[PDB]
Amino acid sequence: SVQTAATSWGTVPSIAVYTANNGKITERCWDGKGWYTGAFNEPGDNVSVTSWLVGSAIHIRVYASTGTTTTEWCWDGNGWTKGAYTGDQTAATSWGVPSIAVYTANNGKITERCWDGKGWYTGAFNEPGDNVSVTSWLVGSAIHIRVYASTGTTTTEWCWDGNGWTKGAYTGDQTAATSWGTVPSIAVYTANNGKITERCWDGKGWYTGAFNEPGDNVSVTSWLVGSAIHIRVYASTGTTTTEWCWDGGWTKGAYT
Numbered sequence: 259s260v261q262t263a264a265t266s267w268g269t270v271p272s273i274a275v276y277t278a279n280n281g282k283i284t285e286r287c288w289d290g291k292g293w294y295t296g297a298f299n300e301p302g303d304n305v306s307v308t309s310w311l312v313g314s315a316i317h318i319r320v321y322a323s324t325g326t327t328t329t330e331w332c333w334d335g336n337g338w339t340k341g342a343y344t345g346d347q348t349a350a351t352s353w354g355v356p357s358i359a360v361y362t363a364n365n366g367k368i369t370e371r372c373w374d375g376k377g378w379y380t381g382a383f384n385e386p387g388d389n390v391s392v393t394s395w396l397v398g399s400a401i402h403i404r405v406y407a408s409t410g411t412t413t414t415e416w417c418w419d420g421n422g423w424t425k426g427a428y429t430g431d432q433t434a435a436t437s438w439g440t441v442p443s444i445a446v447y448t449a450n451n452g453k454i455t456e457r458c459w460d461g462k463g464w465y466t467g468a469f470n471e472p473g474d475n476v477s478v479t480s481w482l483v484g485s486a487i488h489i490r491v492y493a494s495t496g497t498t499t500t501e502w503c504w505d506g507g508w509t510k511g512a513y514t
C-alpha cells in the first residue's frame with residue numbers, strides 16, 4: 259500500500275499530506291476550503307515531513323528516500339528547493355532556528371542526523387529497528403524527544419530528555435506518533451497486519467486508546483486550540499487513504 263506523512267500548522271489549520279506511491283511522492287493540501295493537489299512532486303518510495311512557522315509563513319522540510327538516498331526538499335515560500343541534508347524509512351521532527359532531527363531505518367539499524375542551524379551532523383542515536391516514528395515537545399528551551407523503533411511486532415520507545423537516550427515504558431509493525439502540551443499527552447498509532455490501534459500516555463502510564471480502524475500504513479498530525487486537542491490520522495490501504503478525526507469521538511474526515 260501507499261505510505262504517507264502529514265504535517266499541520268496555524269489556526270485554520272492548514273494540513274499537508276505527502277503520499278509515496280509507485281516511486282512518486284505527491285501532496286494533498288487543506289487550507290480550510292477543501293482538499294487540493296499541491297505543487298510538491300518528487301521521486302521517492304518513502305517520505306517523512308516536518309514544518310514550523312515563522313510569523314504567518316510556513317516552512318516545510320520533506321525527506322524523500324529511494325534506496326539508501328534521502329533527499330531533503332525545502333518549502334520556504336518560493337518553490338520547492340533541494341536542501342543540504344545528507345528503501346530506508348525516515349521520520350523527522352523539528353523544534354524552535356530551527357533544530358531538526360531525522361531518524362533513518364536502514365537494514366535493521368536506526369541512526370540519526372541533526373540540524374542545528376550550521377550544518378548536518380550525526381547524532382548519538384543508534385538502536386535497532388526496521389520502522390521508526392518520532393515526536394518531540396519543548397519544555398522551555400529544553401527539547402524532549404520520543405523515538406518509536408519497531409522490529410517485527412515489538413515497538414521500543416527511546417527517550418531524549420537532555421542527558422542521553424533512555425528506554426521508555428511504552429508497550430515490522432509501522433507506527434506514527436504525536437504529542438501535545440507539557441505533560442505531555444502522547445498518542446502512538448500502530449498498523450499491524452491490516453489494522454491500526456492506539457496506545458496513549460497522559461503522564462501516568464500507557465493504556466489502550468479508543469482509535470481502531472483498518473489500514474496497512476499510518477501517519478498522524480495534531481494541533482491544540484487552547485487546551486483542546488485535535489488529531490488527524492491518515493490510514494492507507496492500497497492507494498486509498500482515509501482521514502480519521504478526533505475533535506473532542508473519531509469521525510471520518512473529508513480527505514481524498
Ligand SMILES: CCN(CC)c1ccc2c(c1)Oc1cc(N(CC)CC)ccc1C2c1ccccc1C(=O)OCCOCCn1cc(CO[C@@H]2O[C@@H](C)[C@@H](O)[C@@H](O)[C@@H]2O)nn1
Pocket residue numbers: 312319330332340341342343355356358373375376
Ligand atoms: C532568514 C531571514 N532573516 C532575516 C530577518 C533571518 C531570520 C532569522 C535568523 C537570521 C536571519 O539569522 C540568524 C543567525 C544566527 N546566527 C548568526 C550566524 C547563529 C548564532 C542565529 C539565528 C538567526 C535567525 C533566527 C533567530 C531566531 C529564530 C530563528 C532564526 C532563523 O530563522 O534562522 C535562520 C538562519 O539561517 C542562516 C543559516 N542557514 C540557513 C540555511 C538553510 O538550510 C536549509 O534549511 C535548514 C533548516 C535545513 O533544512 C537545511 O538542510 C536546508 O538547506 N543554511 N544556513
Ligand SMILES: CCN(CC)c1ccc2c(c1)Oc1cc(N(CC)CC)ccc1C2c1ccccc1C(=O)OCCOCCn1cc(CO[C@@H]2O[C@@H](C)[C@@H](O)[C@@H](O)[C@@H]2O)nn1
Pocket residue numbers: 404415417425426427428441442459461462
Ligand atoms: C512519585 C514519583 N516520582 C518520584 C518517585 C516523581 C513524581 C513527580 C515528578 C518526578 C518524580 O520528577 C520530576 C522531574 C522533573 N524535572 C526536573 C526539572 C524534569 C527533568 C519535573 C517534574 C517531576 C515530577 C512532577 C512534579 C510535579 C508535577 C508533575 C511531575 C511529573 O509528572 O513529571 C515527570 C516526572 O516523573 C513523574 C511521572 N513520570 C514521568 C515519566 C516519564 O516517562 C517517560 O516519558 C513519558 C512522557 C513517556 O514517554 C514514557 O513512556 C517515558 O517512560 N514516567 N513517570
Ligand SMILES: CCN(CC)c1ccc2c(c1)Oc1cc(N(CC)CC)ccc1C2c1ccccc1C(=O)OCCOCCn1cc(CO[C@@H]2O[C@@H](C)[C@@H](O)[C@@H](O)[C@@H]2O)nn1
Pocket residue numbers: 270271273288290490501503509510511512513
Ligand atoms: C454554522 C453551523 N454549522 C453549519 C450549519 C456547523 C458548523 C460547524 C460544524 C457543524 C455545523 O457540524 C459538525 C459536525 C461534525 N460531526 C459530528 C461529530 C461529523 C461531521 C463535526 C464538526 C462540525 C462542525 C465543526 C465543529 C468544530 C470546528 C469545525 C466544524 C466544521 O466542520 O465547520 C466550521 C467551518 O470551518 C471551515 C469549514 N470546515 C471545517 C471542516 C472540518 O473538516 C475536517 O477537519 C479539517 C481540519 C480537515 O481534516 C478535513 O478533512 C476534515 O473533514 N469542514 N468544513
